[PDB]
């Protein structure tokens, strides 16, 4: 009806685990600890001879301004909102908005509408290689939309899935089976 | 545990109408029809010989800041937040998320930790002459609050009351037995 962004909104009790953990393991691994920003993070990617970062927080702030600058000014904006926010809404309440509002896309927004667009399901039937996939596309959706660059995007996919095994959440079964998918 | 502004976080479909109502009519009565900012109700507000002219979603915005500067440029800063708040989340999402995060004195953040802490109960077990005085307490929580300015306190909250049955949220027959509560 109204508002692109603001097609379908779904409840973080409704998504899936695999769908919020390939989320968090591929953007944010310590995403349920720190507050806001992640400063290990920074350094862990610092030191790095590629690695972003960034928070989901800080993802989710980002988005928040009505324009779009990548000014040095506007990265510490962006910071200050997501410790505020962190100060605010739990992690919880966070990682939902988050999840909701994520570009993936083919004018999808939101793991809901991306799962319609993508595999014709609502985000809480999707599979464990289905849900790698939405995972993959936040870093470039363009350039990852499994529409036109399956290469690529089943490529990212599988690095997705690799992330959710080195963070334990998945087994190496699971892994074997979904990389094969 | 921590974050005494995450202290109790309540869904909107568990608070009653009588308190969503209190708050819209009291605090931005165009809520569900405007984006982000009421022009006609600061034109409205201007034209007075007292009046607020922000909105429900300019109030979460001005929380959503680290710092407190009340600078014609933060005013400005807020509005296009409230403005890309609305373009990203539905009105029920931009309600649920003021309504919890909204301080109403006495160290209680949320309608459901006002609820507790004035009357011992859970929002969602609130009467309208209770919804009635949460919504008064916004405009200045220290100056209104019950527990020291139980005066003021039922003065404004009767006040809150007189908006709802103009805005037709509650009956004249509800208002007359509220306001002597
Ligand atoms: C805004 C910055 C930090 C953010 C930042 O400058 N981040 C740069 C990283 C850039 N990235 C690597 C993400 C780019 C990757 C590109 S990507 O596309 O992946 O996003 C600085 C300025 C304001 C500082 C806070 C205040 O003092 C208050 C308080 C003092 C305490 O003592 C420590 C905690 C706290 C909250 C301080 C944290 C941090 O000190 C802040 C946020
Ligand atoms: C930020 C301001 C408006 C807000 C403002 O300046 N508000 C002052 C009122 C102060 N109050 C009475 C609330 C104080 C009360 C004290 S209280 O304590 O009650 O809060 C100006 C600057 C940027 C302008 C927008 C952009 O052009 C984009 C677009 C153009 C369209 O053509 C019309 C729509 C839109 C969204 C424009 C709307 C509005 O034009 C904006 C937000």
Redesign the interface.
Do not use: A, C, E
């Given at each position: 009806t109204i508002?692109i962004?603001?097609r379908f909104?779904v409840?973080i009790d409704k998504i899936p685990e695999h769908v919020i953990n390939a989320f968090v393991a591929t953007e944010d691994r310590n995403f349920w600890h720190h507050f806001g920003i992640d400063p290990v993070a920074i350094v862990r990617a610092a030191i790095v001879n590629v690695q972003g970062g960034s928070t989901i927080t800080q993802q989710l702030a980002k988005?928040?301004?009505?324009?779009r600058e990548r000014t040095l000014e506007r990265k510490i904006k962006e910071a200050?909102?997501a410790?505020?926010?962190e100060?605010?809404?739990?992690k919880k309440?966070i990682m939902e908005?988050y999840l909701?509002?994520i570009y993936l896309g083919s004018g999808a927004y939101g793991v809901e509408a991306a799962a319609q667009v993508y595999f014709g399901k609502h985000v809480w039937e999707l599979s464990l290689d289905e849900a790698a996939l939405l995972a993959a596309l936040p870093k470039a959706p363009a350039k990852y939309n499994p529409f036109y660059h399956p290469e690529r995007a089943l490529q990212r996919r599988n690095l997705v899935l690799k992330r959710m095994l080195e963070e334990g959440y998945i087994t190496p079964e699971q892994y074997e089976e979904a990389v094969n998918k």
């Open positions: 508002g962004q603001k909104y409840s988005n928040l301004f009505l324009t200050l909102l410790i505020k926010i100060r605010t809404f739990d309440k908005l909701n509002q």
